[PDB]
Structure 1
Amino acid sequence: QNYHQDSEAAINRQINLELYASYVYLSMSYYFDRDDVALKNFAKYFLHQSHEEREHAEKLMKLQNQRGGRIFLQDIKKPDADDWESGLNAMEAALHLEKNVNQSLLELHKLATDKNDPHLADFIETHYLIKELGCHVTNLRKMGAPESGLAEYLFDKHTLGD
């Protein structure tokens, strides 16, 4: 039976995807920490996200062990950008990223379903950050970002500062 082989390879792919995502948020957080960007709450938002995604990876690592599989780590690739350009662009990038992480998470779930396997730690993690990142994107665009730096300043103070 190919299943426990597929099942642990999928979990292993997902572990690397979550560590990758944690790495992207870390990169974004400290971009807003730069003196020429200097948006403190944009930096806190992404840093907190960075820690949540590392927690997702550890949860899947605990899960791989509980199912008797073998954790197989890979390189954590660098993000696609060093310069994230703007708070709008970073939120757009976080939205794209979460969608892709979620898509590979549906496939993990469609593997344990579609092979009759309850015990799907997935049922807690799915789809909640996506709408929030989309709302952030929407509000920044309506305010005039990224051309308007006043928009991102005030979004940092009013939405992400609460």
Structure 2
Amino acid sequence: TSQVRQNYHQDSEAAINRQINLELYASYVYLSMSYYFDRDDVALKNFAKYFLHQSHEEREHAEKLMKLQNQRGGRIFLQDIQKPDADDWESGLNAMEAALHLEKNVNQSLLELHKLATDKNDPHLADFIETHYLIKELGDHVTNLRKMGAPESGLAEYLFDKHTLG
């Protein structure tokens, strides 16, 4: 056992690992989205940039949670990073929608983590959920793209790319 471990639950340890995998997965999703929009037959440079940045942000979450497991005296175990549910993301609107679904799910996993912490009386971990959320952020992007007429309007997706994401 670790010298620096103290009131860290064996189930807390496993919960952390699951989230790490979870956050790496979201990073892969956003990576896959980004290069979809880099395609010569999709060609939305700012979507591509936008999701490429969100890919970095989630990999950074995984690293924070890795920096957790280690700080708390636990042991990092890494699983396969499963490939995303799509190769073709169809439209900017569709990816924005998929990303909204993904983040709500990731958030739900964090709420569970936070509950487990509370019930194991682990206040340092409940705080390590040091988030600030982009759920509204994609929320907003989805609303706008719909009102502009996406995805049937190809003008809509093109402009939003220049004006909101530019």
Offset at residue 117 of structure 1 (A)? 1.0
TM-score (norm 1): 0.95
Does the C-alpha gap of structure 1 residues 122 and 2 become closer, same or farther in structure 2, counting only changes over 3 Å?
closer
**Higher helix proportion:** 1
**Aligned-residue offset at 1:67:** 0.7
Question: 1 CA distance for matches of 2:56 and 2:126?
Answer: 18
Alpha-carbon offset, residue 122 of structure 1: 4.6
2:11 maps to 1:12: no
The CA deviation at 1:3 is 6.6
Q: Contact (CA 8 Å) 2:117, 2:126: kept in 1 or not?
A: no
Q: Name 1:140's counterpart in structure 2.
A: 145
Consecutive aligned runs of 4 or more in structure 1 exceeding 3 Å deviation:
121-127
What TM-score, normalized to structure 2? 0.92
Counterparts of 2:127 and 2:108, CA distance in 1: 12
Identity across aligned pairs (percent)? 99
CA distance in 1: counterparts of 2:126 and 2:78, whole angstroms: 19
Question: Residue by residue, what CA displacement relative to the aligned partner does 1:83-106 show, whole Å, maximum 9, x if unpaired?
Answer: 000000000000000000000001
**In 2, distance between residues paired with 1:48 and 1:6?**
32
State the distance in 1 between where 2:53 and 2:19 align.
20
Q: Per the alignment, in what secondary structure is the counterpart of residue 73 of structure 1?
A: coil
Q: How many correspondences in the alignment?
A: 161
> Given that residues 102 and 126 in structure 1 are in contact (C-alpha distance below 8 angstroms), is that contact kept between their aligned partners in structure 2?
no
Gaps of 5+ in 1: none
Gaps in structure 2 of 5+ consecutive residues: 1-5
SS for the counterpart of 1:94 is helix
Worse-matched range after superposition: 108-117 or 39-48: 108-117
Distance in structure 1 (CA, Å) of the matches to 2:126 and 2:31: 25
User: 2-side partners of 1:146 and 1:139: how far apart?
Assistant: 11
Q: Is the 8 A contact 1:31 1:83 kept in 2?
A: yes
